[PDB]
RNA sequence: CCCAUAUCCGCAGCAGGUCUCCAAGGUGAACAGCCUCUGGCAUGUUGGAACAAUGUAGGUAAGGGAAGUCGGCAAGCCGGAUCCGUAACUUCGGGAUAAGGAUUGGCUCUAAGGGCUGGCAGCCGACUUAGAACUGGUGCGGACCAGGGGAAUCCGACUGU
RNA sequence: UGCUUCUGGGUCGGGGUUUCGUACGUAGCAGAGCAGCUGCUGCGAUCUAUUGAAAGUCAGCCCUCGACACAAGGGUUUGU
């Protein structure tokens, strides 16, 4: 017969290959479409999820009850050090697929990028790129490279740039830097390749790529949760207590008549560690990193126009299971995918974003920097010492 | 922003934190954490418990 | 103009809240919540400022044994405000309010939350203290 | 160079964190043996009965957090083995573990 | 040890057992 | 090597249980070749095996 | 000699079955439960490394409180003692620990409850009962032990098999 | 993911953060009171000072460049 009381289905078939992701770094599946009216720029960036805190800001939306009020919202800190450009790649357009035509690396390539090409850096003799770097100080090699760039002027349609993260400034345990192709969308192919050759062997910060109050896309791998049951993974209804052979299970698989179990039947398996791409994430603030001038360093990154305090965005006791953020960072509305220390791909928006909630200008009031490692109740060290007084150890 | 003090402890509650509790007679109280919440619901004296601000104001520390 | 945001709901079908006005009733048994589409094995629940269908369980004989419409004012379940406070109350309370919004009682004992007071103007007029 | 006697303080708590109640003190003995095998490259580790009593002083559940251990690499006596040297592991009674460095004591 | 006797009979599927019954 | 016979005989001579029979771990071979109650009485007089005292149970 | 989680019977070193004696200290009404002394033993046909899903045995859950289900199934609530108080009905015996309340810790005191010798005097041995003060973050039968209750209907008097 | 540019991981210790809530000892003409000697000496739960004290804190928290030893290692294999 039929189902008596109809119900919506548990889970989505658009995400059904729930396997462990083969890639660890979040890959861009689709870059934004180019147009020659816009100038040349990067369309993606590769940051690292640091932590979470509050935010305090004014709401400017007409008609709401929440208009001109001081709300709090969850934000993600993503530490985004400036990446090093160490190569380019062109793409020819074929009726079979968008094929990579010719990849051209740089002359001086740092050891951070050298770590990626090796599975075992200790036993290796560190002899990569040695016969390739001899093409940059001879007569014939420069001619062959100029012929390669001149062929890329003619036949390449899509030009992606090769940039790797700067891992030495990061507080992570690993030293192997992540590499990434970023599609440069801008003017003509010749101006695009000239700008990429100008930006070769250069630093790329985040102020050049993104800006304030921009809706961006976050690509990354889900926090892994291991082999889980169907109640934990697909969130099905639990069977009652009186069941003999288990209750946190799926009772009926299917009918007698498709002598198989269908793909849509919710089974038990891998929960977490899945590649995901979430859209419409709002940047509240791109904070400056630590910099030293006139002797003492300037670290007031959590300072707003209304706070005027010398505290940084690093909370009391640092970020939990991440370390301390010394580099320049971005701060996003809501939560992003992934655990701590997770590599996290930023991307510009695919959709032409013109909405009232999306075109809102954000003026920050207070950035919460209390200790997230437990119930924190102080914002900074001098405020804590002024409230506590002299201690026994002091 | 209005930094309201805790009713049990007297600590400076920030707008991201706290759990506010209103009784039937009125007198809306603010609490920093569930420690102070459980102490108020079990009706403990803040002047008798050592780590509060009222203990320090009473015993001149 | 300004619509109501979602808050935490912890009074499903079955809850006996108390009736916080001077009609004569003491309890209000929630029989269903007005304004819920529904889904398989979900109880309809009402938070602060929700129009609900109740029944006077004990009180006046003119009030008992018939269905009244009500508005839930106070709940014990902690619900998040937009400015970032978790305000919660001592008990679960509501008042008998007809289909258009007019109250049946005159005065309201206890505080009425502003999430109910901004949505229902006639309940906020009878309320002395707010939230 | 080979015959070296020296002091260490083992934090048993970060090595015992996680295991169940009936398997805390034998696991603590196993991490002290792994500590000896890590600092001293000798597979033949012989821990003393006084340190057995010191670990098992409270019970099988409650194991002390820090402990003071004299670790000594020694040349092998008769009944010769493919292990050329051995490691003797001795308990040292210390009141409090405040500012205790790895003191390399002399013979 | 001597030859074990054959696995004994156990009324497993009579009218007395509700774990399996046929159309009646 | 094997001292359960000497421990049982020492319990039978000392008129207590073998929980209180303390055997000498150093002089194992001098106890192991006793094999008789007359030699175990000589071990008692030599003091190689000792009656263990009662485990305390205070009344205080 | 074993006399029973290995010497008996169950196909076996089988969580089953098999008739008796001896019977410490505390806590406590107790030969109840928990810890210990004499005596005994190596965790019950094995160990090592991780702590995935489904399990089995224990628990804990904000708000609601049976809305789940054939059905309060299971779990949970009450639980000891002292002082009150205890209904309908009845075969006047019961119901009844009905139902419904208060107290319970530690410390320091006071009062009362006795023998032997020569209304009095001297010398000694016992546990209880009642009351008061002080004090601890209202916690106190703090583990263990340990009744959920009330109103009705049908059947069988009952105890028993 | 890491495993010799006098450089790097690890161990310990030190700080940072945080959890509970004020440790032992000593002192107190503080303490319901009780006993003994001509005000003192003993018992006494609890209170105050030392003392936001004592204890724990990565096993999957944050910085140390303070002490310590270790780390240019072993094996199997793959050819246009
Ligand atoms: Mg249908
Ligand atoms: Mg069953
Ligand atoms: Mg936290
Ligand atoms: Mg249903
Ligand atoms: Mg057996
Ligand atoms: Mg037992
Ligand atoms: Mg076992
Ligand atoms: Mg065993
Ligand atoms: Mg609950
Ligand atoms: Mg509750
Ligand atoms: Mg029902
Ligand atoms: Mg039951
Ligand atoms: Mg009755
Ligand atoms: Mg009838
Ligand atoms: Mg009968």
- DSSP letters spanning B8-60: SS--B--TTS-EEEE-SS---EEESSHHHHHHHHTT--TTTSTTSHHHHHHHT
Tell whether A3 lies on the interface with B, counting CB pairs under 8 A: no
Tell whether A150 lies on the interface with C, counting CB pairs under 8 A: no
Q: How far is the CA of F53 from the centre of ligand 6 (A)?
A: 26
Q: Which stretches of chain B sit within 8 Å of chain C by CB?
A: 15-16, 18-26, 28
DSSP A261: -
Closest CA to A235 of A9, A20, A14: A9
Compute the distance between CA of residue D40 and CA of residue D54 in angstroms, rounded to an integer. Answer: 22
- Residues of B within 8 A of C131 (CB-CB) are 22, 28
Q: Which among B1, B11, B12 is the nearest to A366, CB-wise?
A: B1
**Chains near F (3 or more Cβ pairs under 8 Å):** none
Question: Which nucleotide is nearest to A225 if distance is taken from CA to C1'?
Answer: G52
Cβ separation of A66 and C82 shorter than 8 Å? yes
**Chains near A (3 or more Cβ pairs under 8 Å):** B, C
Tell whether A15 lies on the interface with C, counting CB pairs under 8 A: no
Resolution, given in Å to one decimal, reads 3.0
Q: Is the separation of the CB atoms in A260 and A270 below 8 Å?
A: no
CB atoms within 10 A of CB A159: 23
Closest CA to C46 of C82, C77, C18: C77
Closest CA to A196 of A154, A35, A206, A187: A187
Q: Left, alpha or beta for A206 (phi > 0: left; psi -120 to 50: alpha)?
A: alpha
Q: Is the separation of the CB atoms in D55 and D64 below 8 Å?
A: yes
Nucleotides of G under 7 A from a protein CB: 11-12, 25, 36-41, 48-49, 51-56, 62-68, 71, 73-74, 137-139
Q: Is the separation of the CB atoms in B35 and B19 below 8 Å?
A: no
Compute the distance between CA of residue B30 and CA of residue C87 in angstroms, rounded to an integer. Answer: 9
- In this complex, whether E and A touch, counting 3 or more CB pairs under 8 angstroms, is no
Q: How close B23 comes to chain A (CA, Å)?
A: 25
Method: cryo-EM
Q: Is the separation of the CB atoms in B29 and B4 below 8 Å?
A: no
Residues A186, A190, A196, A199: is their CA dihedral positive or negative?
negative
- Report how far apart, in Å, the C-alpha atoms of A273 and of each of A15, A221, A355, C30 are: 13, 6, 33, 43
Compute the distance between CA of residue D67 and CA of residue D31 in angstroms, rounded to an integer. Answer: 12
Compute the distance between CA of residue A279 and CA of residue A275 in angstroms, rounded to an integer. Answer: 14
Closest CA to A69 of C80, C82, C3: C82
């Amino acid at each position: 017969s039929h189902r008596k009381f109809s119900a919506p289905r548990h889970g989505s078939l658009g995400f059904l290959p729930r396997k462990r992701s083969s890639r660890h770094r979040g890959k861009v599946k689709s870059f934004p479409k180019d147009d020659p009216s816009k100038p040349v720029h990067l369309t993606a960036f590769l940051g690292y999820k640091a932590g979470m805190t509050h935010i305090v800001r004014e709401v400017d939306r007409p008609g709401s009850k929440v208009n001109k009020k001081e709300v709090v919202e969850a934000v993600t800190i993503v530490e985004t050090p400036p990446m090093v450009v160490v190569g380019i790649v062109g793409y020819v357009e074929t009726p079979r697929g968008l094929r990579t035509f010719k990849t051209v690396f740089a002359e001086h390539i740092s050891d951070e990028c050298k770590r990626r090409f090796y599975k075992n850096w200790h036993k290796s003799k560190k002899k990569a790129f040695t016969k390739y770097c001899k093409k940059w100080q001879d007569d014939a090699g420069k001619r062959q490279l100029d012929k390669d760039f001149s062929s890329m002027k003619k036949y390449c349609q899509v030009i992606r740039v090769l940039a790797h993260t700067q891992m030495r400034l990061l507080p992570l345990r690993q030293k192997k830097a992540h590499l990434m192709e970023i599609q440069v969308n801008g003017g003509t192919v010749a101006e695009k390749l000239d700008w990429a050759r100008e930006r070769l062997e250069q630093q790329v910060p985040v102020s050049q790529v993104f800006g304030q109050d921009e809706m961006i896309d976050v690509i990354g791998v889900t926090k892994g949760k291991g082999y889980k049951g169907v109640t934990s993974r697909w969130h099905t209804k639990k069977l009652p207590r009186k069941t003999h052979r288990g209750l946190r299970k799926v009772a009926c698989i299917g009918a007698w008549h498709p002598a198989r179990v269908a793909f849509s039947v919710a089974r038990a398996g891998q929960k977490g560690y899945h590649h995901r791409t979430e859209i419409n994430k709002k940047i509240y603030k791109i904070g400056q990193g630590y910099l030293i001038k006139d002797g003492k360093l300037i670290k007031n990154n959590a300072s707003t126009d209304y706070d005027l305090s010398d505290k940084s965005i690093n909370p009391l006791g640092g970020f939990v299971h991440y370390g301390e953020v010394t580099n320049d960072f971005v701060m996003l509305k809501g939560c992003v995918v992934g655990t701590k220390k997770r590599v996290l791909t930023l991307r510009k928006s695919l959709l032409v974003q013109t909405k009232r909630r999306a075109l809102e200008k954000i003026d920050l009031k207070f950035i919460d920097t209390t200790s997230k490692f437990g119930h924190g109740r102080f914002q900074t060290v001098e405020e804590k010492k002024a409230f506590m007084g002299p201690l026994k150890k002091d | 922003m209005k930094v309201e003090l805790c009713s049990f402890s007297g600590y400076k509650i920030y707008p991201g934190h706290g759990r506010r509790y209103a009784r039937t007679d009125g007198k809306v109280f603010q609490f920093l954490n569930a420690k102070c919440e459980s102490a108020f619901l079990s009706k403990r004296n803040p002047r008798q418990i050592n780590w509060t601000v009222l203990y320090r104001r009473k015993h001149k520390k | 103009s300004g619509a109501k945001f979602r808050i935490s709901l912890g009074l499903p079908v079955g809850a006996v809240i108390n009736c916080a006005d001077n009609t004569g009733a003491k309890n209000l048994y929630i029989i269903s919540v007005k304004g819920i589409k529904g889904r398989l094995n979900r109880l309809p629940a009402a938070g602060v400022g929700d129009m609900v269908m109740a029944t006077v369980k004990k009180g006046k004989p003119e009030l008992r044994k018939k269905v009244h419409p009500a508005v839930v004012i106070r709940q014990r379940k902690s619900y998040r405000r937009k400015d970032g406070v978790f305000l919660y109350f001592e008990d679960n309370a509501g008042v008998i309010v007809n289909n258009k919004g007019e109250m049946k009682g005159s005065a309201i004992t206890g505080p009425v939350a502003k999430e109910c007071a901004d949505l229902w103007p006639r309940i906020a007029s009878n309320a002395g203290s707010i939230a | 160079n080979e015959v070296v006697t020296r002091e260490y303080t083992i934090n048993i708590h970060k090595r015992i964190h996680g295991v169940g109640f009936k398997k805390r003190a034998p696991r603590a003995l196993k991490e002290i043996r792994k500590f000896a095998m890590k600092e001293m490259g000798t597979p033949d580790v012989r821990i003393d009965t006084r340190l057995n009593k010191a670990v098992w002083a409270k019970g099988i559940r409650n194991v002390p957090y820090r402990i003071r251990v004299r670790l000594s690499r020694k040349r092998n006596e008769d009944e010769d083995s493919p292990n050329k040297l051995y490691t003797l592991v001795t308990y040292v009674p210390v009141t409090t573990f405040k500012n205790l460095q790895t003191v390399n004591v002399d013979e | 040890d001597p030859v074990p006797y054959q696995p004994p009979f156990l009324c497993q599927w009579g009218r007395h057992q509700p774990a399996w019954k046929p159309l009646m | 090597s094997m001292l359960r016979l000497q421990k049982r005989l020492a319990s039978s001579v000392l008129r207590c249980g073998k929980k209180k029979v303390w055997l000498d771990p150093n002089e194992t071979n001098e106890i192991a070749n006793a094999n008789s109650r007359q030699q175990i009485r000589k071990l008692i007089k030599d003091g190689l095996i000792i009656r263990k005292p009662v485990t305390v149970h205070s009344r205080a």
